[PDB]
Amino acid sequence: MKIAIPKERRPGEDRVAISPEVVKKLVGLGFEVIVEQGAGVGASITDDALTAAGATIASTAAQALSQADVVWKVQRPMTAEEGTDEVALIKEGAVLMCHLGALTNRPVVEALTKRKITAYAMELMPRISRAQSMDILSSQSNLAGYRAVIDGAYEFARAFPMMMTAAGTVPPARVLVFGVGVAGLQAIATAKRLGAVVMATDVRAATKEQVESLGGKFITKQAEAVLKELVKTDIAITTALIPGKPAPVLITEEMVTKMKPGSVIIDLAVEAGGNCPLSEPGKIVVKHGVKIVGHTNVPSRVAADASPLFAKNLLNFLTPHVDKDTKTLVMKLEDETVSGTCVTRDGAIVHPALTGQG
Amino acid sequence: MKIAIPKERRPGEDRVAISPEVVKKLVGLGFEVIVEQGAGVGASITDDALTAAGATIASTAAQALSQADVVWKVQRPMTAEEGTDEVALIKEGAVLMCHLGALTNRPVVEALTKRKITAYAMELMPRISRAQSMDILSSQSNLAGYRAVIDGAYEFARAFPMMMTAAGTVPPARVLVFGVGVAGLQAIATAKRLGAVVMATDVRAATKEQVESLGGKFITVKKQAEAVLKELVKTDIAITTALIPGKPAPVLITEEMVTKMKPGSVIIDLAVEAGGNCPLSEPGKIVVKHGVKIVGHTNVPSRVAADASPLFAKNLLNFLTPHVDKDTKTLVMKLEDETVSGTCVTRDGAIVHP
Numbered sequence A: 001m002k003i004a005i006p007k008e009r010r011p012g013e014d015r016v017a018i019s020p021e022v023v024k025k026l027v028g029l030g031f032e033v034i035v036e037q038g039a040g041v042g043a044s045i046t047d048d049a050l051t052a053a054g055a056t057i058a059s060t061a062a063q064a065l066s067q068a069d070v071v072w073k074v075q076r077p078m079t080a081e082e083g084t085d086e087v088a089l090i091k092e093g094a095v096l097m098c099h100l101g102a103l104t105n106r107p108v109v110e111a112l113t114k115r116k117i118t119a120y121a122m123e124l125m126p127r128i129s130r131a132q133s134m135d136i137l138s139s140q141s142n143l144a145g146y147r148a149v150i151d152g153a154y155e156f157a158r159a160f161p162m163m164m165t166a167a168g169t170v171p172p173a174r175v176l177v178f179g180v181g182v183a184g185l186q187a188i189a190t191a192k193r194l195g196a197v198v199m200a201t202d203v204r205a206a207t208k209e210q211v212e213s214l215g216g217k218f219i220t221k222q223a224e225a226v227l228k229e230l231v232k233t234d235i236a237i238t239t240a241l242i243p244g245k246p247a248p249v250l251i252t253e254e255m256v257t258k259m260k261p262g263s264v265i266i267d268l269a270v271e272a273g274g275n276c277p278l279s280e281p282g283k284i285v286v287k288h289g290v291k292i293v294g295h296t297n298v299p300s301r302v303a304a305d306a307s308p309l310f311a312k313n314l315l316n317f318l319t320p321h322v323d324k325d326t327k328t329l330v331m332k333l334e335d336e337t338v339s340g341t342c343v344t345r346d347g348a349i350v351h352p353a354l355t356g357q358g
Numbered sequence B: 001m002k003i004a005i006p007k008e009r010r011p012g013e014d015r016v017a018i019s020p021e022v023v024k025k026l027v028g029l030g031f032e033v034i035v036e037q038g039a040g041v042g043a044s045i046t047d048d049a050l051t052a053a054g055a056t057i058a059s060t061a062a063q064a065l066s067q068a069d070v071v072w073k074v075q076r077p078m079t080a081e082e083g084t085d086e087v088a089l090i091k092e093g094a095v096l097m098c099h100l101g102a103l104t105n106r107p108v109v110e111a112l113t114k115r116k117i118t119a120y121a122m123e124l125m126p127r128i129s130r131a132q133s134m135d136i137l138s139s140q141s142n143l144a145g146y147r148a149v150i151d152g153a154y155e156f157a158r159a160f161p162m163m164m165t166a167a168g169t170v171p172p173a174r175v176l177v178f179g180v181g182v183a184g185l186q187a188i189a190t191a192k193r194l195g196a197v198v199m200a201t202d203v204r205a206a207t208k209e210q211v212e213s214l215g216g217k218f219i220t221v222k223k224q225a226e227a228v229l230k231e232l233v234k235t236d237i238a239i240t241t242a243l244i245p246g247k248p249a250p251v252l253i254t255e256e257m258v259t260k261m262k263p264g265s266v267i268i269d270l271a272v273e274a275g276g277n278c279p280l281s282e283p284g285k286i287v288v289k290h291g292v293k294i295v296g297h298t299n300v301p302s303r304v305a306a307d308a309s310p311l312f313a314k315n316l317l318n319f320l321t322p323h324v325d326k327d328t329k330t331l332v333m334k335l336e337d338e339t340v341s342g343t344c345v346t347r348d349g350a351i352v353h354p
Helices: A020-028 A047-052 A061-065 A106-114 A129-134 A136-155 A182-193 A208-213 A222-230 A298-321 A336-341 B020-028 B047-052 B061-065 B106-114 B129-134 B136-155 B182-193 B208-213 B224-232 B300-323 B338-343
Strands: A002-005 A032-036 A056-058 A070-075 A095-099 A118-121 A163-165 A168-170 A174-178 A197-201 A235-238 A264-267 A283-287 A290-294 A342-345 B002-005 B032-036 B056-058 B070-075 B095-099 B118-121 B163-165 B168-170 B174-178 B197-201 B237-240 B266-269 B286-289 B292-295 B344-347
Touching (some): A020 A032, A032 A061, A106 A342, A129 A336, A136 A182, A136 A235, A136 B136, A136 B163, A163 B136, A168 B300, A174 A182, A182 A235, A298 A336, B002 B061, B056 B061, B070 B300, B118 B338, B129 B300, B136 B237, B136 B266, B182 B197, B182 B237, B300 B338
Parallel strands (some): A002 A032, A002 A070, A070 A095, A174 A197, A174 A235, A235 A264, A264 A290, B002 B032, B002 B070, B174 B237
Antiparallel strands (some): A163 A168, A283 A290, B118 B344, B286 B292
């Protein structure tokens, strides 16, 4: 009747799958909540904030998960091959809930299967209305979009808003968002509230409506229209990274050579190759007088807000299956969100694309 | 006449006392404009951009200031004892306009005086309505206030604006601006733009009205501290901006106060160079103490060099323009002018203002 949350061990990860308010709800459901010491420090969540909420602190990940019936993590557990065998720390037959990156991480699913662990890959949450509150892709990408604007403004040597002053007028910055998904949408909104002239481009002609509702201008030869804007653009933000596929090239370095010195490019797709071939994971590349920034775990750059949201997504997914009167958890297998996220259970891999080498 | 602008040499200074726009006005005023090669690189001002405006590019600094009758700079020239006497490069009898930091640097003033160079300490610009467009302290501090918010949001692990999503409502960040001068005002405006709830505190009451006009809330109630601390314990980003003329910055956030703040909170100390409004700040560093980040970046306006330079150059232009004589067809600084009298610290091999 124990749920455990370890500290994230993968490099670049500062989020944690828990928050004081979720600890309280979990305790209210009848759970004993165990958190590894310092697991939330990166997200501004102290051990004492956790214990005040009802959680108990374990000194290590092994002790935290030793007798846990349920384990909540942010990123998929590490296998012996990657260093620390976290999969081994999960009790055989236990339940794991996390962003498993299942589709592109067959080895982790196999490792979990050997220990007969039931794993729910949160990133596979079905796209149904009643599941939006359990959607981790949505909650994290939204913060990533906001963060993109903050990092761009930070690296930019000019101020974003137009300023009328006694010494003259400070022109507003011009921003061009590539890709109008959850992240792109928030980038537009944040770049807009900061005072910039915001442009946006996306192949899906259905996005123009959303861009305009936020006060942005949709760019309507096509590459010629984008280029005309790009050469005037101060901050270019790309957000097109389609899972299970290389990031689409949206800004060639030929185009970057046409940009104005001092410009900034935020490449949120650097992880999959980047929408700009010049971006490098975890670095800020200075080329042709342009800064090409490609930070690695953007939502982690907003860890303090990302963590509580991630914990809530998890809580919303688990809550419907808990009988707080008997203090028992029974994941209803017929529930669409359960069957949809389960990739392995009782020693059997259930996702069709992860049973062998394709 | 000839006016020259060199590259700023002091460490970390990326601003330049020139802009293509101001170059056009100078040429139109009858000036021959010369700029040191790559002087505007840090300000996104290319040599070709300046050439297009009508300026001449000198390969070196010496070559730029050699025959200059007027010299414009951002920071005071360096004295011989400090690596390179940029002073020795300024033609004797020439005119210099820049942030001289005169009232705290006698050595630079004497070095200029020995060369019979007339120097106008722009930072001494009189606080009169007429000089607003010539005031470098206001133009640079305005951008500093903006930058403080950017740097704070950058170091903050949360989002500034309130966000209502499918996963719930996340409250907006809470900002507390200490000192409502030019910098403080911009910090409030920018913090507001980003969606934060903004509180402010300053000894002047005439500032409450200004704060409210921007959407900010004025902290009010002897023990003003109690009211302040009450807001500080809920604050996510504290921005301090109080600087006293040539004196140690007043202390506004004690270490004791810092220990009462929320983990992950951020403090931007814009007064770090003058001692800091917070005793935990260190010039050029981000200190973590009691779970709080105390940020003390130096030369904040340079963190906004591409916008700071155009404005700084305009302040200089606005100050110089009224003194071109449409008779000697040259530059004659009117001695009776309130701004000339208020900024000159040394003239023709004499001292100024004692």
